[PDB]
Amino acid sequence: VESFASMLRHSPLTQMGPAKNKLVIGQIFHIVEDDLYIDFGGKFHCVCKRPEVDGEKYQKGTRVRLRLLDLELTSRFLGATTDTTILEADAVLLGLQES
Amino acid sequence: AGSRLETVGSIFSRTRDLIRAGVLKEKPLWLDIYNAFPPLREPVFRRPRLRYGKAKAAVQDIFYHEDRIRAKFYSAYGSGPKAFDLFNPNFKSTCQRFVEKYIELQRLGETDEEKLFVEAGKALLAEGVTLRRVG
Amino acid sequence: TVDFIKKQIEEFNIGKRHLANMMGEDPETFTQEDIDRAIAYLFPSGLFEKRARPIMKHPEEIFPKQRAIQWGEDGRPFHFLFYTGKQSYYSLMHDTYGKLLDVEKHHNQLRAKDLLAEKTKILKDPIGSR
Amino acid sequence: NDLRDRILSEPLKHADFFNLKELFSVRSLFDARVHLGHKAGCRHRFMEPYLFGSRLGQDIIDLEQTAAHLQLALNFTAHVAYREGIILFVSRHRQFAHLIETTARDCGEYAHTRYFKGGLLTNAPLLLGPGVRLPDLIIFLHTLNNVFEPHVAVRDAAKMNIPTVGIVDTNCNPALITYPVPGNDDSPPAVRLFCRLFQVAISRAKEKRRQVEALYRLQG
Ligand SMILES: [Mg+2]
């Protein structure tokens, strides 16, 4: 039986370090007319817009490349006891995954 | 009929007290399961007071000696050319490989950080990976 | 009120037979329109309110639709959404949403197989659909 | 009557009666992203004991305490299902509403993922009908509504003395929940894992109730 502490040490999330400026691949699980809901393995799902080039091949289950900036968008405003989360993540599109 | 006070105590505490009192003559079915299997913490209502003064939280930061090595690699070479993949439980990142070879190299008895860092970079170059220095 | 509806159903059939007997017609074809013209004759009510005139119709059409019993003798609700307050509306919403996912799943499979055999049939303007 | 007491009291003498220890493990939970949490700013005060630590401002839930809680939660869920108990799935989250609604249909139990009316559990006779049997257990897959406030059913259930087994994130209030399970309720793999675990837990309880009934029938 592997102790839980050992699992965190070798987990890919811990090996990433800071989430800012990290090249992480993700998979699309929901498609709107202009918004691509991408899951990159983090806690939440980042949202990006379809690029004007090769936009027809961004379908469900397609793998894309992301540049994570904040793992979870969250800020504190005055008069708020607890921070108001956005339940999303911030990322940008660098293209499609090169199979 | 029953008790509807949330702050008096747990659901178990009120139910067994009413039964012992003699008002609830029909024992609820979930009560027997509760006696045999109790939870870790009895559900007692408590007011979420806000922390004032010098008191802080007891949550510890998760830091490792590996993280100290990873900071130097990220500061110098930035993010590695390999793309991180979180879907693979057994994924081996370029930085993780750098740390693993750094640990093995320092087992030879080397103490200088500069020697450890440079040799690890040369050792990675022998494996074919790219380590284009930033700036 | 299931039994009360049943009692109304049987006596209305009996009542219809009496009306046909006195009208001197064929009881096998004593249609509702014939019932209305018979009632309007036997009881000549002069009233402007059309709904206030004497009526004798099918009790299913007269009595409002009633909710069926939602639970058994042990109290277990029959439907799985009874605790949402509105079981009928949400079950319709659940089924409607499920059909969309199945269509989306089916369309996704068709796109994978490179086939588009469906057509948009929403346009029913000549029929006048609302 | 006495044999009816025998069949009701039979599973009370075995801790592992339903053999639920094989359904999940620490490795199984870890691959479902159950050890992740919100930022350090949103950390509720009562969730401090259940937190293993914070990783760069991101809280990490201690799965060792999650496994201990989840073991009792599944064990408690099955027993109330074994005794022919009404189980209600409550989750006010507009990303798994259909999945949770379909999960309850397969298990044969009830779900309420829509808007929760004010006088539902408390003023039951007016809302539902003259004589209504209140649910004997409530499962919360999400203890928060869409406005980041504690769900009304959490407070109402304590008033009506109805045990609640609810997954609590790092920003929830496990004070009134009798069987809290500290975990992650946001990532799709985590939510899917919890539903499947409660799917098999109910199905085994329903089946093993029927098997013992058959044995009782041939006893006499
Ligand atoms: Mg959450």
| A12/B88 Cβ within 8 A | yes
Whether residue D187 contacts residue A88, with contact meaning beta carbons closer than 8 Å, is answered with no
Report the C-alpha gap between D48 and B48 in whole angstroms.
12
Report the C-alpha gap between D143 and D163 in whole angstroms.
14
Cα distances (angstroms) measured from residue A99 to each of A59, A64, A95: 15, 10, 12
CB proximity under 8 Å: A 11-50 to B: 12-18, 21-25, 27, 40-42
Burial of A27 (0-12, 13-18, 19+ CB in 10 A): middle
Q: Other C-beta atoms within 10 Å of D168: how many? A: 25
At D59 the three-state DSSP class reads strand
DSSP string, B21-45: HTS--S--HHHHHHHHS--SS----
Strands in chain D per DSSP E: 36-39, 51-55, 58-61, 87-91, 110-112, 137-142, 164-168, 179-182
Report the C-alpha gap between D86 and C74 in whole angstroms.
11
- Which of D196, D215, D206 shows the shortest CA–CA distance to D78? D206
Strand partners, A90: A70
Side chain identity, residue B65:
H
Q: Helix %, strand %, coil % for chain C, to 5?
A: 55, 0, 40
DSSP string, chain A: ---HHHHHHHSHHHHH-SSTTEEEEEEEEEE-SSEEEEE-SSSS-EEEEPPSSSGGG--TT-EEEEEEEESS-EE--TT-SS-EE-S-BEEEEEEE---
Tokens read off for D55: 């990783």
| Interacting residues of A46 by C-beta distance below 8 A, sequence separation 6+ | A26, A37, A38, A40, A66, A68, A88, A89, A90, A91
Strand partners, A67: A23, A92
Whether residue D10 contacts residue D21, with contact meaning beta carbons closer than 8 Å, is answered with no
Side chain identity, residue A19:
A
Tokens read off for D118: 């004010």
Q: Which residue has the tokens 């017609």?
A: C25
Q: For chain D, how many structural domains are there in total?
A: 1
Tokens read off for D13: 């003498």
Question: In this structure, what DSSP letter does residue D11 have?
Answer: G
Tokens read off for D70: 């989840």
Cα distances (angstroms) measured from residue B93 to each of A24, D19, D113: 11, 38, 41
Q: Which residues of D touch C (CB under 8 A)?
A: 84, 86, 88, 98, 101-102, 104-105, 108-112, 114, 117, 120, 127-129, 131-133, 135
Inter-chain CB pairs, C–D, below 8 Å: 47
Q: Which residue on chain B is closest to A10 by alpha carbon?
A: B90
Helices within chain B (DSSP H only):
11-21, 29-36, 65-77, 94-106, 113-127
Resolution of this model in Å is: 3.6
Chain D residues within an 8 Å CB radius of C84: 112, 114
Range of the domain at D160: 1-220
Q: Other C-beta atoms within 10 Å of C33: how many? A: 8
| D85/B11 Cβ within 8 A | no
Question: Is the dihedral angle over the CA atoms B18, B20, B25, B26 positive or is it negative?
Answer: positive
Question: Is the dihedral angle over the CA atoms A4, A9, A10, A15 positive or is it negative?
Answer: positive
Tokens read off for D20: 């639920």
Report the C-alpha gap between D176 and C42 in whole angstroms.
70
| Interacting residues of C112 by C-beta distance below 8 A, sequence separation 6+ | none
| Interacting residues of C86 by C-beta distance below 8 A, sequence separation 6+ | none
Report the C-alpha gap between D161 and D154 in whole angstroms.
11
Whether residue D66 contacts residue A79, with contact meaning beta carbons closer than 8 Å, is answered with no
Beta-strand pair D179-182/D164-168: parallel
Q: Which residue has the tokens 């050792």?
A: B123
At D181 the three-state DSSP class reads strand
Helix H or strand E segment including D40: none
At D184 the three-state DSSP class reads coil
Cα distances (angstroms) measured from residue B27 to each of B18, B24, B32: 10, 7, 9
Report the C-alpha gap between A35 and B27 in whole angstroms.
55
Chains that touch B (3 or more CB pairs under 8 A): A, D
Phi, psi for residue B108 in degrees, rounded to 5 = -75, -5
Q: How far is D128 from chain C (nearest CA, A)?
A: 6
Return left, alpha or beta for D192; rule: phi > 0 is left, psi -120 to 50 is alpha, else beta. Answer: alpha
Report the C-alpha gap between D78 and D204 in whole angstroms.
8
Burial of D206 (0-12, 13-18, 19+ CB in 10 A): middle
Tokens read off for C63: 């009595």
Q: Other C-beta atoms within 10 Å of A55: how many? A: 11
Strand partners, D61: D51
- Which of D16, D69, D59 shows the shortest CA–CA distance to D36? D59
Phi, psi for residue A40 in degrees, rounded to 5 = -110, 15
Whether residue D165 contacts residue D176, with contact meaning beta carbons closer than 8 Å, is answered with no
Phi, psi for residue B118 in degrees, rounded to 5 = -65, -45
